[PDB]
Coordinates of N, CA and C in Angstrom, one line a residue:
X1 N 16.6 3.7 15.9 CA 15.5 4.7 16.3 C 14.2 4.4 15.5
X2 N 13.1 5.0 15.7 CA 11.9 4.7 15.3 C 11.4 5.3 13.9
X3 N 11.0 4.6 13.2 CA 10.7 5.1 11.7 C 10.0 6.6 11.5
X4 N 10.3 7.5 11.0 CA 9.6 8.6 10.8 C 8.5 8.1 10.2
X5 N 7.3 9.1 9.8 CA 6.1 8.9 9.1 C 6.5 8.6 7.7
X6 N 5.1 8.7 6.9 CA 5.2 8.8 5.3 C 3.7 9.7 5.2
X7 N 3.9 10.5 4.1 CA 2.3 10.3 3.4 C 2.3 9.7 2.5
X8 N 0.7 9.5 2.4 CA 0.3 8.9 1.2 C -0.9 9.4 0.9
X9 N -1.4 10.0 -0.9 CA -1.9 9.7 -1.5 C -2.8 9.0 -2.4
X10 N -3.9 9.1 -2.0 CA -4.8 9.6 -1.4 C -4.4 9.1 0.5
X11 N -5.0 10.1 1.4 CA -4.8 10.0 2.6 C -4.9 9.0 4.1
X12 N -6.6 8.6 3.4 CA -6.8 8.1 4.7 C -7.5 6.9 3.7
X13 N -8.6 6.8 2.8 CA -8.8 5.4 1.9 C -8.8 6.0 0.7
X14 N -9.2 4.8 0.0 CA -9.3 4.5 -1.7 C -10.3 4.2 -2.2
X15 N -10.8 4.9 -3.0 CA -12.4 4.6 -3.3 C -12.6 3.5 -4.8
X16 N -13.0 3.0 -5.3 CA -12.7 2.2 -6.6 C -14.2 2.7 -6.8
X17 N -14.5 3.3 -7.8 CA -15.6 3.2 -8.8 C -16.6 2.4 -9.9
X18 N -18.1 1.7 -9.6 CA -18.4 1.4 -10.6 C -18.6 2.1 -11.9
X19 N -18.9 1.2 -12.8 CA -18.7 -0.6 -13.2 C -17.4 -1.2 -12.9
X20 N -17.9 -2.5 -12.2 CA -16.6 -3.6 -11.8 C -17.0 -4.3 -12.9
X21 N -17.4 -4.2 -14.0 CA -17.5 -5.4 -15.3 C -16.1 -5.2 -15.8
X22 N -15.3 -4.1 -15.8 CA -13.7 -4.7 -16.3 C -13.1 -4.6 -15.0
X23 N -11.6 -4.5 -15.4 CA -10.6 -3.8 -14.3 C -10.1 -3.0 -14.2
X24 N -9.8 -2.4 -13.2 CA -9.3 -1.1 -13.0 C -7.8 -0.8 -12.2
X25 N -7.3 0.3 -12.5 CA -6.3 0.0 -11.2 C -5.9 1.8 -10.9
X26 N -5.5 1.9 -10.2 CA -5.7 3.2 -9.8 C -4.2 3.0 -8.6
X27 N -4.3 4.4 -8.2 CA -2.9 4.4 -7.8 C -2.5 4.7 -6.6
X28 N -1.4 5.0 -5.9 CA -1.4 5.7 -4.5 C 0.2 6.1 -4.7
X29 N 0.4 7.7 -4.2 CA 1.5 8.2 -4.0 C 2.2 8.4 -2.3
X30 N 3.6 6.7 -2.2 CA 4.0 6.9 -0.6 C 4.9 8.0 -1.1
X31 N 5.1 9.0 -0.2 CA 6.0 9.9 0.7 C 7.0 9.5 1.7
X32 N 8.2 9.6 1.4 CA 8.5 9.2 2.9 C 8.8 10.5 3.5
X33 N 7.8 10.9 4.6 CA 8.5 12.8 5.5 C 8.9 12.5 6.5
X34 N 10.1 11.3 6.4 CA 10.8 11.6 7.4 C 12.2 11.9 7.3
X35 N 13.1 11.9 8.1 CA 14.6 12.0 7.9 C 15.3 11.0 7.6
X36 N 14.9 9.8 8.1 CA 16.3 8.8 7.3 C 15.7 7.9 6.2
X37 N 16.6 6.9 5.6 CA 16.0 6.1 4.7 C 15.5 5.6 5.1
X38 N 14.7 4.6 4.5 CA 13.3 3.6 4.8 C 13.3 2.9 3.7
X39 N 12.7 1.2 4.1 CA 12.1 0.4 3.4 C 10.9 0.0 3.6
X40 N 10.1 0.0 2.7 CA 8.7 -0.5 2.5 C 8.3 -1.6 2.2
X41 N 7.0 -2.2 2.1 CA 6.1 -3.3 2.0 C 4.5 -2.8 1.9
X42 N 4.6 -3.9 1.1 CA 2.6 -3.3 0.8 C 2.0 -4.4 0.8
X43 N 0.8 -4.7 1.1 CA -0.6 -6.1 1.3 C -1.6 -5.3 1.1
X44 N -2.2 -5.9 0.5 CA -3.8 -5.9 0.5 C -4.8 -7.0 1.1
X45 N -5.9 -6.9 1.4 CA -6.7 -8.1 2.1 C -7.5 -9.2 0.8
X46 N -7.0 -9.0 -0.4 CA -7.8 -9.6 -1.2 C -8.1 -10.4 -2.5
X47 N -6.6 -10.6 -2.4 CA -5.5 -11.1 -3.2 C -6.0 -11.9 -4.6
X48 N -7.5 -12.5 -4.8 CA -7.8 -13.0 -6.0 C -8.6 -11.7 -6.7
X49 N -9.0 -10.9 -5.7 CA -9.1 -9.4 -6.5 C -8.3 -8.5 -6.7
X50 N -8.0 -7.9 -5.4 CA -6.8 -7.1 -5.8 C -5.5 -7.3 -5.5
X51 N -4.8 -6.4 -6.8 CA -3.2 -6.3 -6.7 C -2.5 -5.1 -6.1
X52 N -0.9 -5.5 -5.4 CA -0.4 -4.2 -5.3 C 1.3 -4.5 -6.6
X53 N 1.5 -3.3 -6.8 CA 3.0 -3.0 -7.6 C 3.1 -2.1 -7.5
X54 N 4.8 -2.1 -7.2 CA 5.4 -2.6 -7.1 C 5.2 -3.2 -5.4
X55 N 5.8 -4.3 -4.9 CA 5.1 -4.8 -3.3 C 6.4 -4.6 -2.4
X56 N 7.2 -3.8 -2.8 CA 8.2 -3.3 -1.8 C 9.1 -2.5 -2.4
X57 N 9.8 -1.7 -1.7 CA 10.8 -0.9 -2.2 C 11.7 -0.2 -1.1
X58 N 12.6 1.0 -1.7 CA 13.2 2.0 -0.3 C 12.6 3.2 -0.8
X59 N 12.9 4.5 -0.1 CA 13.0 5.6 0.0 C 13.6 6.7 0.7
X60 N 14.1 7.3 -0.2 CA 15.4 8.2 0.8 C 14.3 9.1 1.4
X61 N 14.6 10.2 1.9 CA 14.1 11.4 2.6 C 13.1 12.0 2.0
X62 N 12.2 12.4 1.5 CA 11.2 13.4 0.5 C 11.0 12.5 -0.3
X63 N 11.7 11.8 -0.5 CA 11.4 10.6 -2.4 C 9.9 10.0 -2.0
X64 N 9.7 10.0 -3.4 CA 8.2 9.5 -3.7 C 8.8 8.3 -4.7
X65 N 7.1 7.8 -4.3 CA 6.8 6.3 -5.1 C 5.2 6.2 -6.0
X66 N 5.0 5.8 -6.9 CA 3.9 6.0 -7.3 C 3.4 4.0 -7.3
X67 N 2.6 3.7 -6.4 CA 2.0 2.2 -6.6 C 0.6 2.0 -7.3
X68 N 0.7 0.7 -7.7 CA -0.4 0.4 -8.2 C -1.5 -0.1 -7.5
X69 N -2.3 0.2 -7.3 CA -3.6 -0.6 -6.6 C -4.4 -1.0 -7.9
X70 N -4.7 -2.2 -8.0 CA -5.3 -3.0 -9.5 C -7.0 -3.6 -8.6
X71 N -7.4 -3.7 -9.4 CA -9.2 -3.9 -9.2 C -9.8 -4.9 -10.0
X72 N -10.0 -6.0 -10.3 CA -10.2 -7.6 -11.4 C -12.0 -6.6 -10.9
X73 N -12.3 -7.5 -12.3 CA -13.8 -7.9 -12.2 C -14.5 -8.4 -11.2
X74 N -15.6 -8.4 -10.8 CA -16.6 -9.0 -10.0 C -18.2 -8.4 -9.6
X75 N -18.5 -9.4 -9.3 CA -20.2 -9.1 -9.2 C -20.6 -8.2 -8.0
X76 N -20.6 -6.9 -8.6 CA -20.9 -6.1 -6.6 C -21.8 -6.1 -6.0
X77 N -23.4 -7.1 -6.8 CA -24.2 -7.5 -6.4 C -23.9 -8.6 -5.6
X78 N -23.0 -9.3 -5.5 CA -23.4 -10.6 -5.1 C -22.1 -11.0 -4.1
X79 N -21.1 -10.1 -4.5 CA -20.0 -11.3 -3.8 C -19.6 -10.1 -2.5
X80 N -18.5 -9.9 -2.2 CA -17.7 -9.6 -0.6 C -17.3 -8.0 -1.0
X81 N -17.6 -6.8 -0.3 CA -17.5 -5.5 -0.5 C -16.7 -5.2 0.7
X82 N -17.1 -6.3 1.8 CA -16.6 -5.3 2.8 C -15.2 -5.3 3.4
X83 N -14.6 -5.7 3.7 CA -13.7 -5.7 4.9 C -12.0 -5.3 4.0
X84 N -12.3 -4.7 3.3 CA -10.9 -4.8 2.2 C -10.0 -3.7 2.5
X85 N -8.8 -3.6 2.4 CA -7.8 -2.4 3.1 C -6.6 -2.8 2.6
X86 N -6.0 -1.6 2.3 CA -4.6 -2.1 2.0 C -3.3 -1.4 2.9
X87 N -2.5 -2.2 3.4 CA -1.8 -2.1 4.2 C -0.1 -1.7 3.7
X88 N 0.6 -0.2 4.5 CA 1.6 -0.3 4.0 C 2.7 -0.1 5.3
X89 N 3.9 -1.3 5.2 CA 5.1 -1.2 6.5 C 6.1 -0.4 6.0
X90 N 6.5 -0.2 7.1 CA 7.9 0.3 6.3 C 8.8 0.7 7.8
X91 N 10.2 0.3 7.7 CA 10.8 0.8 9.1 C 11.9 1.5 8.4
X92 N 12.9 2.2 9.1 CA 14.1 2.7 9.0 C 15.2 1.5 8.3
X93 N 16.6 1.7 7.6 CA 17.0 0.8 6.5 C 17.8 0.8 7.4
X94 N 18.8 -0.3 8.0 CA 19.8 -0.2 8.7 C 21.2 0.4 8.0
X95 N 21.8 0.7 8.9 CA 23.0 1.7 8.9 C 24.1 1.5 7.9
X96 N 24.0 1.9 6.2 CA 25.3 1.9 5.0 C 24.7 0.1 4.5
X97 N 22.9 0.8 4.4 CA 22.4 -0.4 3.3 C 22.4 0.5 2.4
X98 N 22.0 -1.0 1.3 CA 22.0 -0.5 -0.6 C 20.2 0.0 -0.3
X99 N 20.0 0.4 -1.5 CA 19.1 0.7 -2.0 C 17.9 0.0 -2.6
X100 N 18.2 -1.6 -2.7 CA 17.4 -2.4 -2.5 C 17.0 -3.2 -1.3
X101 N 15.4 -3.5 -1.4 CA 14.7 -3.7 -0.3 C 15.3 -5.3 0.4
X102 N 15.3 -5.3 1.3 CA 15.8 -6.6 2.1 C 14.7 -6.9 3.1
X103 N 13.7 -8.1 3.1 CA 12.8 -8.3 3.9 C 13.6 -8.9 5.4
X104 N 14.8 -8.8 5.4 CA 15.5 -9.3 6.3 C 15.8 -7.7 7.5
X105 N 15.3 -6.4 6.8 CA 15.0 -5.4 7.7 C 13.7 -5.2 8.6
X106 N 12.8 -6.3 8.3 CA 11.8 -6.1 8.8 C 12.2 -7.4 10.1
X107 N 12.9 -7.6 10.4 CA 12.8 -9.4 10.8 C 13.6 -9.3 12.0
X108 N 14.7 -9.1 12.1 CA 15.5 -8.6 13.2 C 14.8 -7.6 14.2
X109 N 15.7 -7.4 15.0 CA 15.2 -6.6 16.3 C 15.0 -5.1 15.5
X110 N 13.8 -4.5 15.4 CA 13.3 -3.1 15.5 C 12.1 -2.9 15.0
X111 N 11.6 -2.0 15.0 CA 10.8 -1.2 14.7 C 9.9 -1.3 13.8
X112 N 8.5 -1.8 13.6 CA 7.9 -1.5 12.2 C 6.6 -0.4 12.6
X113 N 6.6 0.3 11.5 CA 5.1 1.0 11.6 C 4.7 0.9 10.3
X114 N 3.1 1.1 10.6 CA 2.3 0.4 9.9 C 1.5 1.7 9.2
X115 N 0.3 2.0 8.5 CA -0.9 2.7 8.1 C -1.6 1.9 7.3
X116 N -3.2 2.0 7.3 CA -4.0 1.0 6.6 C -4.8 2.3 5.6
X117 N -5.2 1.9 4.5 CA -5.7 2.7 3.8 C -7.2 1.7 3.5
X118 N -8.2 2.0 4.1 CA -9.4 0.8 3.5 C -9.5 1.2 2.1
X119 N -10.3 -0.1 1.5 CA -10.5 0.0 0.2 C -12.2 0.3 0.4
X120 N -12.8 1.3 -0.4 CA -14.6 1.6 -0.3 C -14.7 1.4 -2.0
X121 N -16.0 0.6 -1.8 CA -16.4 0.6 -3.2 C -17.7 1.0 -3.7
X122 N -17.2 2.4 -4.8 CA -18.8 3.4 -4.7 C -19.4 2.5 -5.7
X123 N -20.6 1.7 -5.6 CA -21.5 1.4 -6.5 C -22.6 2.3 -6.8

């Protein structure tokens, strides 16, 4: 059957704050609101800047997750602001799995859904 939703905190993006002269990392809370368990996955678009952790996991029913979205240094004068978003999958766990994530749920016949969170950066 088809993956119930999640929320996440913050909702719809992620704002990063200057100064980018150090790093930063800041956070996001998934939800899973749906009924069955679920496995997750997380990307970002920008991999020599930003990080995600933990980059997969499960979630039973209501359980929360607290991730890291991490922020390196860079020139916000000069270099790439735009197009950055971080992406999280997640489908339903198949039927009397463990509790660790198996990328081999994502791969077989079913179901993924998706939500993108863009990254905005207030200078």
């Amino acid at each position: 059957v088809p993956p119930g939703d999640i929320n996440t905190q913050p909702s719809q993006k992620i704002v990063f704050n200057a100064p980018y002269d150090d790093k930063h990392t800041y956070h996001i809370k998934i939800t899973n609101a749906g009924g069955r368990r679920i496995g997750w996955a997380i990307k970002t678009t920008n991999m020599r800047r930003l990080s995600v952790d933990p980059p997969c996991g499960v979630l039973d029913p209501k359980e929360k997750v607290l991730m890291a979205v991490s922020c390196d240094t860079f020139n916000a004068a000069t270099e790439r602001l735009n197009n950055d978003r971080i992406t999280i999958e997640w489908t339903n766990t198949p039927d009397g799995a463990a509790k660790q994530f198996r990328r081999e749920w994502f791969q077989g016949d079913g179901m993924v859904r998706r939500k993108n969170l863009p990254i905005e950066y207030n200078l």
